[PDB]
Design a protein around this ligand. Structure first.
Ligand SMILES: C[As](C)(=O)[O-]
Ligand SMILES: C[As](C)(=O)[O-]
Ligand SMILES: [Zn+2]
Ligand SMILES: [Zn+2]
Ligand SMILES: [Zn+2]
Ligand SMILES: [Zn+2]
Lengths: 314, 315
């Protein structure tokens, strides 16, 4: 069985150590091509991303899932150039984040389903690069449009086997409403990662979703470094409850950011100079010294993402 | 001010001819036509419909359109250049921002927005080398804080380059008055500004006071009433002529050949109500005004001389 990357299909075995929630650039639709000098230049942003991915490579990372959607300014040609030059697999995403323009906002659930299908089954833009995941974002209480997006995501996942990954505010238990809507469409929890779950510290929330078969995205560990040790101990708490197979870990890093105040990227890079290598270089050794076996950590960073990303019509 | 930027390169002022100063090839959102061309049937189908529509307009005398679609209306300048070449009609492209800026625009300072508008006029749009010839700005209400930044950045790009500013209001709220106050605070001459969508309200005192201050008055959406009648909208042109303000009038259709930034199928409703498309101004409004007694020299002044003076980069 095979996973779509920006360089074409790969086998499950080739994915290796996978970071399941990352971004090359957090931007807006059209913005990198209209104003590349916001980032210095397109070449500067690509170079910064290739160096950072090569360093993550130096640490063991073999695949990242770029969960930038259309409205996060995903530029799959950028992703392809960076993947090739870093020699790291990148999974592209479809879906919608929190900044849809009018042309998306106004669409029905049936139209949105066709757009997500197009990106999975045909390709993104005119590139022929197919998405391997669907990303959906909600506010704490899901809005009417966000509910349409979740329903279209579920329908596109049921038709193609590709998984869904979510943005929450876990501070607001946002995954419970997302999961209820997704299940109303018949989507299996084993096809869904409830993301940004490391921003909440009520373990009851994490364990209940994991007991239903959801993947738990503990995906923003180094954002607390801008305590990260405490967020990483959520990984250990889920392992200790018996939910190893439900854990996904990532940095939620980026190499350029225009969807926030200017110069935020410099602040972030000062708090986490390891960038995407933070998970393999800091978190993994930390969990090792708390007594988690290497085998458990390999299961979380290799086997769990492979099972999550492999298209499964179940 | 001897040449104007078009999607085919510079043209001299005399080549612009009959100009429609507020039009769109497609009303959409940034990145959308590239990501989902099948919303419009296909990219080829949208292009072919726009070529037939422009050629229609050209046979009715139009020589240039100003496509006032900004980044956030999904302007695709490569689509504009293709259509301009195939229809042999000049198209002036725009910079600026309309009412749907994404977060990456909404979070920018006035200095940052000024640099963006300047790059699209002085360097080029995207990697195409096609340079804007107008700055479009939309406001609502009394002008929001972000919209005020856009207006100020627009005035600053105008004053550095000479290209004019054209606005989207609400004439029913006299919203041009607030735009004019902000733009004048920046030192921009009213003769470099069109207050647009002024035909949406039959408030003659509003129009004449802005015209007397030197603003151009954009009576730019006449057939939207055919989708207040269109004739009533067209009599606002006659009223300004009769007050001696012919030099301040700009007319247009505000037409589109595809629309994704509204409900599905609105383009079909619109086309059924105005089958003339962008030829509505020359086929319907111009003969209506002739029949009301407006002479040829005045109509050529409105449709040729005023757009030339407005678009020529000045000061
Ligand atoms: C683009 As984000 C901060 O929602 O991972
Ligand atoms: C795109 As419009 C209706 O403001 O001209
Ligand atoms: Zn997120
Ligand atoms: Zn993210
Ligand atoms: Zn408008
Ligand atoms: Zn318009």
């Amino acid at each position: 069985d095979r996973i779509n990357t920006v360089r074409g299909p790969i086998t499950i075995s080739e994915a290796g150590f996978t970071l399941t929630h990352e971004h090359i650039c957090g931007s807006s639709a059209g913005f990198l091509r209209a104003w590349p000098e916001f980032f210095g230049s397109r070449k500067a942003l690509a170079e910064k991303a290739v160096r950072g991915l090569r360093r993550a490579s130096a640490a063991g990372v073999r695949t990242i899932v770029d969960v930038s959607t259309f409205d996060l300014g995903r530029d799959v040609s950028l992703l392809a150039e960076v993947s090739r030059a870093a020699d790291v697999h990148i999974v592209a995403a479809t879906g919608l984040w929190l900044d849809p323009p009018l042309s998306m906002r106004l669409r029905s659930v049936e139209e949105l389903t066709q757009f997500f299908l197009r990106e999975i089954q045909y390709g993104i833009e005119d590139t022929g690069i197919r998405a391997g995941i669907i990303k959906v974002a909600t506010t704490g209480k899901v809005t009417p449009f966000q509910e349409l997006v979740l329903r279209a995501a579920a329908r596109a996942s049921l038709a193609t086997g590709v998984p869904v990954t979510t943005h929450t505010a876990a501070s607001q238990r946002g995954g419970e409403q997302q999961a209820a809507i997704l299940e109303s469409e018949g989507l299996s929890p084993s096809r869904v990662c409830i993301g940004h779950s490391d921003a909440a510290d009520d373990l009851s929330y994490h364990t209940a979703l994991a007991a239903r078969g959801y993947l738990i995205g503990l995906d923003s560990i180094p954002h607390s470094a801008v305590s990260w040790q405490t967020r990483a101990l959520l990984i250990k708490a889920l392992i200790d409850q018996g939910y190893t197979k439900q854990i996904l870990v990532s940095n939620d890093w980026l190499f350029g950011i225009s969807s926030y105040v200017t110069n935020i990227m410099d602040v972030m890079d000062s708090g986490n100079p390891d960038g995407m290598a933070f998970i393999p270089l800091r978190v993994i050794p930390f969990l090792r010294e708390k007594g988690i076996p290497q085998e458990t950590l390999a299961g979380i960073t290799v086997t769990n993402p492979a099972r999550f990303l492999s298209p499964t019509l179940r």
